[model samples]
Target: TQAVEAGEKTVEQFVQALNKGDYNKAAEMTSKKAANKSALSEKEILDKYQNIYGAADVKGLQISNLKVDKKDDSTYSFSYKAKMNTSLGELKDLSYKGTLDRNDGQTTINWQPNLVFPEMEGNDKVSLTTQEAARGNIIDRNGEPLATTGKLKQLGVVPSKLGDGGEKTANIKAIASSFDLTEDAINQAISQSWVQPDYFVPLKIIDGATPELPAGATIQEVDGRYYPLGEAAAQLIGYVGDITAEDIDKNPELSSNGKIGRSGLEMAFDKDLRGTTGGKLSITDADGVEKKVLIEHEVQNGKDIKLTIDAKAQKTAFDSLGGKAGSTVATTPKTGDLLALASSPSYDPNKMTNGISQEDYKAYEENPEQPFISRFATGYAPGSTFKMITAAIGLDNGTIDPNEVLTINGLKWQKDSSWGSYQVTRVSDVSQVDLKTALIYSDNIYTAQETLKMGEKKFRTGLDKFIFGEDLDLPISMNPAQISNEDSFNSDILLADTGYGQGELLINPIQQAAMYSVFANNGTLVYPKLIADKETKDKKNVIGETAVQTIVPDLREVVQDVNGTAHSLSALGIPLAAKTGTAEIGGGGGKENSFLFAFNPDNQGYMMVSMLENKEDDDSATKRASELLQYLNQNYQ
Candidate 1:
């Protein structure tokens, strides 16, 4: 009886205080009851309740109409209409039903509020609609599905359908036992019954099975997505993962359940590859069965992707590198179609499809040399390979006369001595030689003299025209640093060193290969192409117009003509034009770098630039390059 009076007094004070705008007093008064019902402490209860109802302004409340239905001396059903005005905008007057139990010496009232506005019912239903997932697919150039879908069955329990008391618990346990779920697991699921009322239905887990589902639960077949090639192009192809909170905040239309591309090409073309997902809406009966189909929509597949790479070539190149640390790119000078771009120590893309295991990912991270860093994207000392560019610059500047002769006879010039001194070795070899002979023998003295005569200003101007310091802007992008210029070019010794592909100059294999095309294509510089054609599926084509064009006309006779340096390779009947370079690499260390640039003019073959780094035996590089050329001629022709 005391409890009943306290509840009535609380409600009466709440209504009166709210109408008076004495919110603080009303909130303090309700704190005790709120704390008892809510799973929070007194302080938290006040904070939570304030966030929800404290700001509400009550304008007025008055009993308009009342209907009393008496059941007994202690029980009655009372329905009342109350005219209420609130600061939330003038709300319509509302009606409420209350069950009053009058016992011993007190009256207990249990009231339920009803909506006053007619449109409120429709608005509430629209707000509570179930959100469906967006769909996506992955396909290859040949229209092969890399990831698809299948049917999935899930089990859940409808808590509202379960009867009150221990009967509900027993039925839930029996179902759980049939699916081999542990008692604790089943109890845990039941504890969350309010949040997930469809508890009798087995939860469908993606990429794996759930124990809650029966041995063979009859589930409607749905298209599921999967990576068929497993991890073939995992890093390059990319994979889909659970959508993040940030994704939803940015794109409210996207569902929280869908997967998104995390990296690589998949991420690059995610919008094109992710298709719209649609489904049918149905009205269900009280028995939790579909009563009528309300709406229907179909899912669309993603567009097909065709890469520039040939699958067979990719595989062969990948295998050729094996466990070594290097990269190889084969592209035609006429057409930039990338035949193969392979780097060694590659990881299986499949590992990332399902998800990378923590242990495996750690192992990959611990590796000193990262296999995934595309080496073609990196730079290295061009060594002697850059000599070709220097030669072109010299030729263009008219600094080199084909017949002029200069000689290096193991002699040293001393400028600081009281008497100018010179150390001589062989007199049979004269102190002078022409440009052709100098290039053939790689005579440092000859090149140094030529550069000195050409002058620094003229040489630098020629270099700018060749795009020495500028970005290559090739199909596979690169930013090559500018060629380093010495303080002066008049010093014979310094010029000699520079002439022999040393002292402040550097380049990479790609640069060397591209530069060689100048001689092969009669001085026309064509930017290397990795992707032949943007339109055709497999056909390869040049990307842009010639970067630089000229009619060297003199370059065709570079291979087999008189005293040609590349005469060695020309004898093999390949009609190849080439140049060889050997440079002393390190100052403190006695290591050497060797380079070979070769190309076939008769056929649309490839320009090959081979570089050997920090080798004690420089001659081995030339030997290896010759062997490679022999092999290519035998198989590719």
Candidate 2:
């Protein structure tokens, strides 16, 4: 009884040691001969166990079905099952058998090689090697590549490897001249560490087949990330970089030879776009030569997405903005596919991939234009563009009579009320105002008076219909367009000010386009589409879609009359109606923004919105939108 009990204790202790990966202690419980077999040291045997686990998460080495019994006078037999966990899945049902010898009422595991666990057979081992798939292209609507991988020469040097002399210093100077690097900087990068003389210290990449012999210098072809359209599609398509610690923590597949989508659609669809990196396990001889691969994983490339972006329209919109701080969002009213979206003062994304020094990156962070921001998703003042909501809401509720004529309270009308003081001012001289004429002339005072007639409850109800205070749940990231809060009705003046696209109203170009899209399409509001071939017909009908296309009659005269605000624009193969907004931001009146939302009723069914900073009351957004429309019709046809 003592022999079997001691043998069970020894075996249990050894199994417990193995479970905790304490190989040194597990070997300590074994017989002298068994632990020293093949002249392998305790540390070396422990090292083999380390190789088997290799970052694999282990679970429940808990010995189940343990049967310890003294069979003959010589030994006690032991048996148990083991379990291990891994990222791939859990490995279970591992069976093990071993023997223990007892003498003088003490027992020790008579560890055969088999005692090391199950399936770790003679001369066998485990290995973790990575297998990566080529990152596919991000395609445009026409299936042309937008962002892709390209190969270029990466040049570098190991200064100590060079044959010492004045000639070699000449070599360094020449290398500096060729690569636009300074001599001192080159020496600093090379001499940073106790790197071996033959080791490479990279400095920069350049386009070349060969550099005339700079003795210590080396150049090799390395795969680099590239945006084919460069700055044109920079903010939208985005870029990629080496696997980061945070990214690996979230997606462990990035542990080896992985890169991540850093921004834009690249960040939105990273997992689907990046595909898979597989792995392998193998058996090897003492010399580390592979005898057999025990298991293998096949590489899987992620599917490339086709965008709804019309590549040419994006470029035309970018060109027409002409380096101003502005944004454009153009979409089709029919199916809600985004034709083009542009944010101006755009940066060159190609510079961001790697090795960018802090000084250069700091410049971007300091820039007032914020070259990285996609203004389409960033909020600004709504300006007069919001009057469309006010007038449309008035017509829907029967608060404003289309045929009724009204007189203004001079150039300025201030109302003293329980809420607060409200000043309704006009920039234009025309005093005789009607609904259509007020819209055409962009008379602030007239539109402000109508908000009083509609009242806060009806005005709030109207805004709620446009998805304000509700989630759009868009496919990508966007800043929400917010109207006034619940307490806003407490002050009727705030409600009145919001009517003409002023007071506490913040709207991004994307939301502006959606708010205007209701009157453009046939009664329903269609969700904006980024990926062309992705969505189904039935799912689209759910987002308050198929709602209504009918509104007030003379409201349709926006582009019809020659004197209408939008009538002066080029038709460009179709007729269009639009509303313009010039918002004085920061309220004290110094700075301003220009906004325009327009739609074409033709077969194309396109609707667009643009916002420009530092522009006057004049319709700056319309000029850019109109020019881009002309170019799009000509080239994209």
Candidate 3:
């Protein structure tokens, strides 16, 4: 009984010490081999356990079911099961057999390499290996690829393909000019001692449109990310690159040679798009022979994400921007699914991922158009596009009667002399104006006076129904809409300015499209969605039926009526309810941002908001809106 208890206690002590990561204490519980083999020192034994176990990230090691039998006096055989968790996977039921002996009244385990791993033998080592998972695809509503993995064109040269010295010189110059490379640089690469007749010397990887190459220069295939829509959807789909040190710190499971999402939806849904990494933990002999694979895991490919974006509408809207620094947002009024989030002055994501020349990158950075900015994710004053919201709020709260007309004397007016030279201005000089007529002509004075009647408290409370000063519940980040720097308007003039969407009022194109949804959705504001599989939320009513019914007709006339600001859109075959706006820059200078919004009233299927910064042409917003609506009528709707 005493010998049996001693053997059990020795095994327990060794396992307990190992579980605590006390390599020194575990080494003390082992005895030197009583054979002809060289003895392992205490330091060497402890270092071996520390190195292999630490590399494995072993945790919660437990040993159980100890069975010991007395072979002779002070000699016994012991066997037990071991299990532990590792980063690669869990290792279980590792049965180890060894001898225990009593020497000088102290029982100690006989040390051997097999105690670390069942299959481990003389001079064996344990190792961990990883295999990366394939990245997922970004798909559009029409089941088309927005971003996916494919081959790209790599332009190269073969020295012997050229006929002679004159022919080679001409081809080198042509190749240099075609791919933005210098003649000296091309010559330097192909003249290396490693060069051979048929060797394909790579020059540069090409993206977007394939370039026309010269003689002796050829194209090869290299595997990498591919963007199908190219620059049209570059600002929305984004790209990926090799994992950095900072990224590895945040995600310890990531391998050094893997890639990670960098921006846009790629960054937003990185975890979902980057699947789990698989690995193998094994033990090998001195000659690097695999003794056993202790544990193995298979790679799990990332999940493909399908968005609500429509490719045709997205491309059309981007094209409508005409290479200007602006944005357009399109949404389904009923379902609140975002159809297109288009930003112009874009860049090809493929170039950013594979490689971009310093000259090309600097050109984009220095361009006045600001090609890198995603304009749809930015905020700007809505101008007269906000008059509809003011009208809805006034009609809902009983501040303005659509039938009762207010008499205006001139193009500008002030509330009182105390305001001191500050006054509201409008484009048209009309004597009589009501809610319907004011919206048709986009009268600033009428909307301001009506909002002043409602007072700051009422206007702030009404504005609460719309989202402002908070982050959107979306995966992609965007600047939030704001009414003013302060919670409430400081003075009456600020309130009046806000009524016309000028004063500190700023809303992003995406939020504007959602706010405009109320008119098309029967007075309920619908929450917008990007992921196609996301669950839909309930629509909340912001205005009554009377207000909706009373205001929609005027909005329709704003597009249909001959004198309306958006009357140009009336010529289009599609029926639309729309409004046009022009927000003046600082000091009421001629510089302004043109705006227009429209929705299909029949089916409430589509709504759009288009803005052109620093307008160069007359009614540019109206023209852009006309173009997109015409396309929708002809091809999409």
Candidate 4:
């Protein structure tokens, strides 16, 4: 009984000590011969444990079914199961079977390397490393690769590993001469404030250029990213490079050498584009042989993201903008897939990713066009374009019917004696017009009378449904669309002006495109999607599920009619339904934000909206939309 308890106690003590990482205590419990053969010395035993488990928090030990029996005159065999918390995970229910005998009145373990962990035997050791993972590619809908990893030589000089015979200065000078960098700058590169003496400092990176080093430099072949079609969607595509100081502070789990996305789509879907890094941990000896695998993980490269973008259409839209400070956007009426979103005054992505000089950045900030801001995010009054929403609201509440006539006495109107006093002016003279003629002539008085009949509650709710005051949750940031209700500018005159799109109403091209989408898709407003499916978060819409059954034919008539606001667009030879708008900015003689929106009656499901910030208020935006539409119809086919 005493001997049995002693055997059980010795096994328990050893396992508990191992769990606590007390290497010396475990070494003391083992027989001298086995300990000498397995770990050699106390220091060697400590090193073995440290290599396996570095700074890992461990747990209590577990043992069961101990059996002790005398096998020989001076030997006893002990068998038991043991478990301990380990670095990899919990190593539970493992055989700790070993021979132990009373030696000089003390129990000792007949230890071997297998006692380290499960299946750790036959001269085994552990190893761990990281395998490089391939970053995800940004591709167009047609599977045309946009931004992807390209293999190139990163020109660098390992200052500590330079060749002998005063070669350091010679190499630096040679690199400067070869790459046209200043010799003083090159000299300072090696002695940089951030550089370590033994670190490999980069001089320059050449894409698909493998020029031999001049004198003292070396090169490392690396998998890096580059945009093949330079400056085409450069600002929109963005780029990637070495992790920034901000990235380190923001993401603690990030590896030191990891690359991170900087801006644009790269910034938006960075996590999904960056795949999982995988590697193995195995023990190797002096002869370079793997004795055992301590850890094994398969690398998961980043998933390729397929965008809904039509590159061909996007290019046409970009060219049509002509480097102007505005935006052109297109989408599928039903799915809300953004086919093209082109904003001009774009910068070189390569310069942005690698490094932008202070001089260049200063010039960028001083530019008149304000290149950094995406014009689609900027809002403008809709003018006649918002009449479509007004028409829908009036028709929905049974305030006005398509065939019902609304009186327009002369070219101006007031909200009757009920409103006390108010006068509304119409730019185009028309009298006794119905809904169809009101939309076609863009008659301010007619639409005004239509909105007053619907009243405030229905009008306010209709504005919310049209995305005027409600959150759209667009992927990019934009100014919220503004409108006035009973709580704010609650007056019949103001409400009439609001209906004509001439009073305190503001919306961006993105939202404008979505407004047109409602007419194109039979009143099912889609939440616009900017990126690919993998990175998309489904957005909720206030009226996404509701169908406005009354306004479809009215919108069709506005575009299909010869007298419609966008009549000039009918010459495009393709089936196009459109509306045109020109808002008087800052008052008379000031600039006008001209706008146009359209959808294909050909059932191709494309809705486009274009805006121009200019004084050319003579259907310039309508003309540009025609040119853009023709290109898209042919190319996107």
Candidate 5:
């Protein structure tokens, strides 16, 4: 009875140690060797068990249904169910059988390789290998690829075709010069004993087109990534690159060689864009040959995402910038579909697919235009392009009447002397300005006076209808539009400045386009959407139909009238509604940003906002917008 009790106690302790992954403690419970054969050392005991379990990434070693039976007075047989979790998956309920021996007061397990794994030989090893899944593609409305998995050329040589000494040497020189590879590297690869004369000896993988090479040299395609539109869609499509050590630490499931989304939509939808990597757990022989497979996981590829973006429009909008630093957002007002998001001065995303060269990367870094910044996702002052929102608010709140005209004295207006030289400035010194005249002229004084009459509370309430301070229901990352640094305006001066889109008013180009959607939708603000499948028919009423009716006609005159600021766009022969503005930067230090917001009023087909930073001409934004619209009309529509 005492011997059986000692044997059970020893087996239980061994099981507990194994469950906790304490190889040192578990090894101590085992005997030196089987019946005086070669004795096993503590170091050997620890090393053998640790190596196999560690390689398998085994955890949660559970022993259940344990039974102990007496074989002799000093020896007992034990059986239990062993289960463990590994990288491939859980290996459940392995039937384990072993013996425990007790002598004097000490009990030890009779160790064998089977104790670790069923039918495992002393020289067998547990092996685990990973299978990488292909990343998903990003497609446009017509299912055209924006970002997709591609291939790079891997050059190889067939030694048989490379004639002897002189011919071979000349061939290698020609190959080296054509592919920019070193001759020493090529010679070293063919020098290996395993490389046969007829075998293909791979030299290097390169991201380039197929180049002319000498005899025996051939090209093979290997896995790579590509952006179809290059710089034209870089700011919107983003790019992928190798994952670093820090990235692996944050996400242990990822492999070091795996790619990760760096920015823009690629980063915004990273989880869906990057598929899961599968693995295999198996037993191998001393010669590194697989003996039996324990688990095999099927790879799961990432899901493809289809967006509402029109590739033609996207390229057109980006090209219209003409190398100026700016942003363009084009959308469908009726469907709330975002057609294009273009940011100028962008880098080629293809160059970033693998690793960018140091010189190339440094050039982009040192450039003053900042090609890396996605302007569409960043916020900026709406400028005079925001007058429509101000007018709509005033109309909805009954603070301004379209038919009544107000008397103005000069190009500047201040509420009182307490303002101290801070006066709302306007471009035209027009008197007798009504709501329609103010909109057509883009009069800052008129909108500022109307906002002051509405006061901070009423104006903020009216602005809230535009969904300020709320996240847009879209995949791309963008900051919400904010009225000021605080919840409400602190002074009348700040409120009046905000009316002309100057005071602390920051809006991303997408939000600016969405806010303008109310005019096209007849008072309903259509929520902007990126993915084609995510389109929603829901709407939010930002203002009344009466306000849109009053504002729409006035906006038309802005482009129709020959004296209007945006009158240059009227030559396109399409009935368009537009507003142009210039925001002074650093208090009029000669740097300014021009903005143009326009839409097709009759069909409600499109709405766009174009911004150009550091432009001399007031119509720079309008000119870019006109080019984009003309291209869309001639080719895309």
Candidate 6:
């Protein structure tokens, strides 16, 4: 038998109970899905509604009038009126309307609230508009364009008035196929909705097109950035790309449509190169159709960057290094102008200009030698090249009379008994040795003794005077050169080891080269400058600044005398000061690290430093240095 359920209720009954403020009865009459007694208690529901509606200002609440409007078989709207109390202390009555849809017994509500307040007078609102991105041109020191912008065609898709179903798919496919996309690619793009645009989506592919538009697509004419040099100076020139999400989050002013420099000089001088972007502001209708142009502003192009690097020298250095993990920095000692700076295993800047693929990016990141790691920033043991500092220190402290003789007794002596266990017989007999001969022969034992006599304080002071740490700020943006002390500095063994450029001291090639400039500049240290000067479009100089200078007269002796360490290079018709270093590699008898630092005094040419790590042969670095010197002698003149 069917009995009338005492608790059964309809939507209308629930609404009537809610309007009368019968909260307990209204809660009981709700549908099972809307209010599950087991999951949510009556108190919890009341608290939830209280938190939602308690903050609203209300003078009174009532369902004074109710209307049920049926729109379709499964939809209806419920409307009601109520009184509201505002902060103005005014009592206002208002009507609230809501639409409810009943589809398959499930209910959904869409509500809209009408707000009213006294009209204000002042216009406090402001609109921020972005300028269009200005085109920048890259030029070499000699006024040659390495990169510039040009006019090009851009492709985009428009989806409007296309019939639903297979026709829509066919239109998208047809556009994709016109761009030479494969069937699989087209299908995949359509499947992923990449081919469709509620408005317009840009396609990656760009080709030259006439005034006539391609079928089923929209073509936009725009000026695109171009690099005429292509791969030449790619790493130095850098590239630009669309602004990323990270950029937007960090810089609120940067728009999503803007471009950003990703690496190299472009990134370093982004502010000067990016220039302000400007465009016209247009008012649009609800459908996003342009109604009228509001405002127009012009974008100013980025400032041009002028570098001190010579194209010929840069290219030569790049070619010489080949695939080696190394860097070469050449600078004019007198003027401190950078002649060339090159690092091997470089990438093509063009690849980054468009966009880099994931595979290529991974390859560069995983490279063991780290091609991107600038060599000027990497520090290595100065090796024997450091003997120059020791020589200077010894001279300044009067530890050894340059002409004083000391017999080595044909056997190298260990400063302490620790290295005595591995002592080897010296080849030469006990003979008179002076500072000049010691440097010429690179006698380890002689230098060690001199270092011991000079003491650590004097040695350190001499190094400080030579600007070892302070002058290490290279224009290439490198890590600072470091000179550290051993655990025991007073020990003769450590002193001797340090004299030959060992121990805890390390320096980069550029720093080593720049150190040699003191001799060429008559003991005056000249800081290397990479940028010569800023110039106008007509190649007229705008900002002219002299290089920094410091004087140290004592270094002239090391290069002028035939008996000095750098005398070997002077024989090549180049009056130059130089020092060669070969540092013992490992504790268990491994190879050595060879280094050479040189500066030509006669021609006032640039200073050079060459180094080879973990070399099996003692003459490897010296030989390379000789080759480089020969090349410079021939070309630089």
Cα lDDT for residue 495, model 3?
Answer: 92
| Candidate 4 worst ten-residue window by lDDT | 538-547
**What would the per-residue lDDT of candidate 1 be over residues 1-637, giving only the tens digit for each residue?**
4444444554555446545545455444432222112133444433433432322222455554555656565555555555543212233445555445554454444322122111221112111122344444444333455454444434545555644577766766665676654656545655664555544433332345644433223233344445544333343444566678677544433444666666655566666666543443333444445544433446555554555444444444445443444444444555444444554455654444434556677776676556555444455555544445555666666666565555555544322353235321111243565655554544445555566677667766755554356565443435674455544555444444555456566555555455455554455555554332453222111111121122122233445665554556666777565666666641467666655566555664665565444444424334444544554445443
lDDT of model number 1 = 0.48
**Model 4: residues with Cα > 4 Å off, grouped in runs:** 1-128, 151-223, 228-236, 280-296, 366-368, 377-383, 403-426, 431-433, 466-489, 502-507, 530-564, 584-591, 614-619, 635-637
lDDT of model 4 at residue 583?
Answer: 64
lDDT per model vs. reference: 0.48, 0.69, 0.82, 0.68, 0.82, 0.54
TM-score of 5: 0.77
Off by over 4 Å in 2: 1-118, 121-124, 153-220, 283-295, 417-422, 479-481, 536-574, 586-589, 614-619, 634-637
Clashes of each: 37, 4, 0, 5, 0, 8
Q: How do the residues 124-241 of candidate 2 rate in per-residue lDDT, one tens digit apiece? A: 5555566676776788788777777788677888767665788767878878887778988776776776656677887777744565746677887788677766667778887777
lDDT (10s digit) by residue, model 4, range 1-637: 6776787788778777776658778877876664433334556666666666443223445677878776665456777777654323344676765667577888776676656655565456565566656788988888887788877667777777665566766776777878767788766777889988789887666766666776557788866687765455765677777876456434432433667777677767677787655666566653557765654667777888877777777777777776766678888766777888777666666666655557677877798776666667667777767777877766656676778886666875786777665577676776668777776777777777778778878877767766666566545656767885335666777788888786787777777777667665556566577665733333334332223444444455656687777777767777766667666563447666667777776674688888777635453577677677887666543
Better of 4 and 6 by TM-score: 4
Candidate 3: tens digits of C-alpha lDDT, residues 214-331: 7988998888878888888887887788888666544555555767888888888877887877888889889777889998989888899999998888888999888887888888
Off by over 4 Å in 1: 1-300, 411-449, 467-481, 484-512, 535-573, 579-596, 610-637
Candidate 4 TM-score to native: 0.63
After superposing candidate 6 on the true structure, give the runs of residues whose Cα lies further than 4 Å from its correct spot: 1-131, 135-140, 145-241, 279-297, 409-413, 419-433, 471-476, 485-493, 534-576, 585-591, 614-637
Model 6, TM vs. native? 0.59
* Candidate 5 local lDDT, 376-452, one digit each (tens): 87888888778888888888888888888888889989999999988888989889999889888989999889889
List the pairs of residues colliding in candidate 3.
Answer: none
lDDT (10s digit) by residue, model 6, range 1-637: 0111111123345445544445456445332333211123455434433432222222224444666666565445555554433211223444555444454444543211111111111111112245555656766667666666666556655555333687767766676667754545434433454454455545443534433344446767766666655443555666777887667444433435767777666676677777755554443444555544433556677777667666666666655555555556666766666666666566656555655556677887798656665565467777766656676656655665666887776665765577666432232344776665665555666777777778778777666654455544333456656566443465555656677678777677666655556555555556666565732111111111111111122223344555454555655665555666677752556656666666664576667776655554434444545555665666554
